[PDB]
Amino acid sequence: GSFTGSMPNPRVFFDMSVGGQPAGRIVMELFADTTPRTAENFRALCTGEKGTGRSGKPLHYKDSSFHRVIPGFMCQGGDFTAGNGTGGESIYGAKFADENFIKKHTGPGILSMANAGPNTNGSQFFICTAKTEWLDGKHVVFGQVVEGMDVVKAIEKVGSSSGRTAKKVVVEDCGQLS
Numbered sequence: 001g002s003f004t005g006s007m008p009n010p011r012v013f014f015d016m017s018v019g020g021q022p023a024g025r026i027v028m029e030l031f032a033d034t035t036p037r038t039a040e041n042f043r044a045l046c047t048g049e050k051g052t053g054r055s056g057k058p059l060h061y062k063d064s065s066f067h068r069v070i071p072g073f074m075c076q077g078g079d080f081t082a083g084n085g086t087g088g089e090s091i092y093g094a095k096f097a098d099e100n101f102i103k104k105h106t107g108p109g110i111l112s113m114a115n116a117g118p119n120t121n122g123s124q125f126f127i128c129t130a131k132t133e134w135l136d137g138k139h140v141v142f143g144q145v146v147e148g149m150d151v152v153k154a155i156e157k158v159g160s161s162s163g164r165t166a167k168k169v170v171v172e173d174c175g176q177l178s
Contacts, residue, residue: 007032007178009032009178010043010176010178011027011029011177011178012042012043012143012174012175012177013025013026013028013174013175014026014028014171014174015171015172015173015174016151016155016170016172017169017170018154018158018169019168022172023154024148024150025148026151026152027145027146027147027148028111028143028145028146029144029145029146030043030142030143031103031142031144034099034101034102034103034142035140035141037092037099038113038140039142041090041091041092042061042143045059045061046061046174046175046176047175047176048060050091057089058080059089060080060174061171062173062174063170063171064078064171064174065078065168065170066078066165066169067083068163068164069155069159069160069163069164069165070161070163071159071160072130074127074129074130074135075126075127076124076125076126076163077125077126077127078124079124088124090123095120095121097119098119098140101139101140101141105128105139105141107131108129108130108131108145109127109128109129109145110143110144110145111125111127111142111143111145112125112126112127112139113140113142115138118138122140127152129149129153
């Protein structure tokens with residue numbers, strides 16, 4: 001009984017490297033209360049608890065590259081299936097209503113799922129490293145950034161309005177810290 005056996009505070013981190021050398025570590029905190037299902041979407045694909053599909057479609061975010069990057073605005077990631085929009089498989093399958101987002105981004109380093117319309121899982125997501133006002137609208141937050149701010153800037157400085165990184169960026173690995 002000393003251990004409840006529950007993990008209401010799950011943690012996930014991604015190892016990002018540039019070119020052919022290590023860059024740093026990024027750790028993010030997921031909320032298992034307001035939006036717990038969203039934390040599972042990353043924790044499951046990252047750890048890969050579901051396993052690889054027998055048809056041949058590994059469910060891992062390892063060896064993935066950011067689709068496009070933009071300084072000040074935000075970095076847009078992509079699905080490991082492709083990132084061109086055609087790919088992007090989710091365990092939820094059918095879309096479901098988005099949970100209310102009572103919490104908002106009070107500062108930079110907040111994770112939010114992109115949603116073109118309401119009640120959309122938002123397979124694509126973006127990170128806001130800076131506070132913006134023109135982006136004021138309907139947004140959902142499912143996690144926050146606790147560390148990795150030193151490297152996050154490294155991805156934007158090499159980024160450009162073109163939306164392409166100057167150096168190659170790929171995740172050496174991904175998993176759940178706890």
